[PDB]
Amino acid sequence: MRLNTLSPAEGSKKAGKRLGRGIGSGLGKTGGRGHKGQKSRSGGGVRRGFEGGQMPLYRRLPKFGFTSRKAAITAEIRLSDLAKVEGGVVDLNTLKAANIIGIQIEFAKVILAGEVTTPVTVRGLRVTKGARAAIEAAGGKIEE
Amino acid sequence: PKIKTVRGAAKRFKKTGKGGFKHKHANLRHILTKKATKRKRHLRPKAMVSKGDLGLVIACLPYA
Amino acid sequence: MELVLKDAQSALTVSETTFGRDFNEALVHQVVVAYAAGARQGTRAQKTRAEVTGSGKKPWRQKGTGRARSGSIKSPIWRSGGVTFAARPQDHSQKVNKKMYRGALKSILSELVRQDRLIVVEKFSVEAPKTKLLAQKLKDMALEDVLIITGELDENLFLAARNLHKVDVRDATGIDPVSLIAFDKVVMTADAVKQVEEMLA
Amino acid sequence: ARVKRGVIARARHKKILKQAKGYYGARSRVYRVAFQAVIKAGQYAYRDRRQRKRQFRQLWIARINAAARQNGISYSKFINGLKKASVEIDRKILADIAVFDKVAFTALVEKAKAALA
RNA sequence: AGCGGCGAGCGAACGGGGAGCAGCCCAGAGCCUGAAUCAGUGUGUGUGUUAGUGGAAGCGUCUGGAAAGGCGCGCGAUACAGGGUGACAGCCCCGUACACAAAAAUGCACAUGCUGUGAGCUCGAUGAGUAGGGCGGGACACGUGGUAUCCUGUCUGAAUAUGGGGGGACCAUCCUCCAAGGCUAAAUACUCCUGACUGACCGAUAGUGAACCAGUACCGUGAGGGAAAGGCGAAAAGAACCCCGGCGAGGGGAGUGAAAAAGAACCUGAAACCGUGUACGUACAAGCAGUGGGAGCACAGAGCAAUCUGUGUGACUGCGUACCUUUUGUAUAAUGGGUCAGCGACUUAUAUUCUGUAGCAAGGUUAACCGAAUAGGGGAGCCGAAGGGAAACCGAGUCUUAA
Ligand SMILES: [K+]
Ligand SMILES: [K+]
Ligand SMILES: [K+]
Ligand SMILES: [K+]
Ligand SMILES: [K+]
Ligand SMILES: [K+]
Ligand SMILES: [K+]
Ligand SMILES: [K+]
Ligand SMILES: [K+]
Ligand SMILES: [K+]
Ligand SMILES: [K+]
Ligand SMILES: [K+]
Ligand SMILES: [K+]
Ligand SMILES: [K+]
Ligand SMILES: [K+]
Ligand SMILES: [K+]
Ligand SMILES: [K+]
Ligand SMILES: [K+]
Ligand SMILES: [K+]
Ligand SMILES: [K+]
Ligand SMILES: [K+]
Ligand SMILES: [K+]
Ligand SMILES: [K+]
Ligand SMILES: [K+]
Ligand SMILES: [K+]
Ligand SMILES: [K+]
Ligand SMILES: [Mg+2]
Ligand SMILES: [Mg+2]
Ligand SMILES: [Mg+2]
Ligand SMILES: [Mg+2]
Ligand SMILES: [Mg+2]
Ligand SMILES: [Mg+2]
Ligand SMILES: [Mg+2]
Ligand SMILES: [Mg+2]
Ligand SMILES: [Mg+2]
Ligand SMILES: [Mg+2]
Ligand SMILES: [Mg+2]
Ligand SMILES: [Mg+2]
Ligand SMILES: [Mg+2]
Ligand SMILES: [Mg+2]
Ligand SMILES: [Mg+2]
Ligand SMILES: [Mg+2]
Ligand SMILES: [Mg+2]
Ligand SMILES: [Mg+2]
Ligand SMILES: [Mg+2]
Ligand SMILES: [Mg+2]
Ligand SMILES: [Mg+2]
Ligand SMILES: [Mg+2]
Ligand SMILES: [Mg+2]
Ligand SMILES: [Mg+2]
Ligand SMILES: [Mg+2]
Ligand SMILES: [Mg+2]
Ligand SMILES: [Mg+2]
Ligand SMILES: [Mg+2]
Ligand SMILES: [Mg+2]
Ligand SMILES: [Mg+2]
Ligand SMILES: [Mg+2]
Ligand SMILES: [Mg+2]
Ligand SMILES: [Mg+2]
Ligand SMILES: [Mg+2]
Ligand SMILES: [Mg+2]
Ligand SMILES: [Mg+2]
Ligand SMILES: [Mg+2]
Ligand SMILES: [Mg+2]
Ligand SMILES: [Mg+2]
Ligand SMILES: [Mg+2]
Ligand SMILES: [Mg+2]
Ligand SMILES: [Mg+2]
Ligand SMILES: [Mg+2]
Ligand SMILES: [Mg+2]
Ligand SMILES: [Mg+2]
Ligand SMILES: [Mg+2]
Ligand SMILES: [Mg+2]
Ligand SMILES: [Mg+2]
Ligand SMILES: [Mg+2]
Q: Which of A49, A62, A65 sits opposite B26 (nearest CB)?
A: A62
Distance CA B50, CA C91 (A): 44
Tell me if A56 and B56 make a contact (CB, 8 A cut-off): yes
**Which residues does chain A have within 8 Å of residue C115's beta carbon, measured at their own beta carbons?**
1
Estimate the crossing angle of helix D75-84 against helix D102-116, to 10 degrees. 70
Q: How far is C186 from chain A (nearest CA, A)?
A: 13
CA C30 vs. chain centroid, Å, equals 13
Closest CA to C21 of C105, C101, C99, C98: C105
d(CA D19, C1' E359) / Å: 55
Distance CA A22, CA D3 (A): 18
Ligand 19 centroid – CA C77 distance (Å)? 19
Distance CA D5, CA C158 (A): 48
Q: Which of C26, C30, C111 sits opposite A1 (nearest CB)?
A: C111
Burial string for A92-117 (b: 16+ CB within 10 Å, else e) reads: bebbbeeebbeeebeebebbbeeebe
3 state DSSP class of C118 = strand
Q: What is the resolution in angstroms?
A: 1.5
Tell me if C26 and A3 make a contact (CB, 8 A cut-off): no
Q: Structural domain boundaries of chain B? A: 1-64
Contact of C180 with C147, CB cutoff 8 Å? yes
Distance CA C77, CA C83 (A): 9
Q: How far is B12 from chain A (nearest CA, A)?
A: 5
Fold of C2-200: Ribosomal Protein L4; Chain: A; (3.40.1370)
> In angstroms, what CA-CA distances link A104 with A81, A92, A96, A109, B27?
18, 10, 9, 15, 41
The residues, any chain, with a CB within 8 Å of residue C58's CB and separated by 6 or more, are C70, C71, C72
Q: If you count residue pairs, one on A and one on B, with CB atoms under 8 Å apart, how many are there?
A: 45
Q: How was this structure determined?
A: cryo-EM
3 state DSSP class of C29 = helix
- Sign, CA dihedral D16-D20-D24-D25, equals positive
Distance CA A94, CA A101 (A): 9
The residues, any chain, with a CB within 8 Å of residue D113's CB and separated by 6 or more, are D73, D81
Closest CA to C128 of C156, C169, C162: C156
State which amino acid sits at residue D29: R
Estimate the crossing angle of helix D6-19 against helix D31-70, to 10 degrees. 20
Interface test with A, best of B13, B31, B56, B58 (most A CBs within 10 A): B56
Distance CA D108, CA D94 (A): 9
Contact of C181 with A2, CB cutoff 8 Å? yes
Q: Structural domain boundaries of chain C? A: 2-200
Max Cα-Cα span within chain D: 86
Burial class (CB in 10 A: 0-12, 13-18, 19+), D105: buried
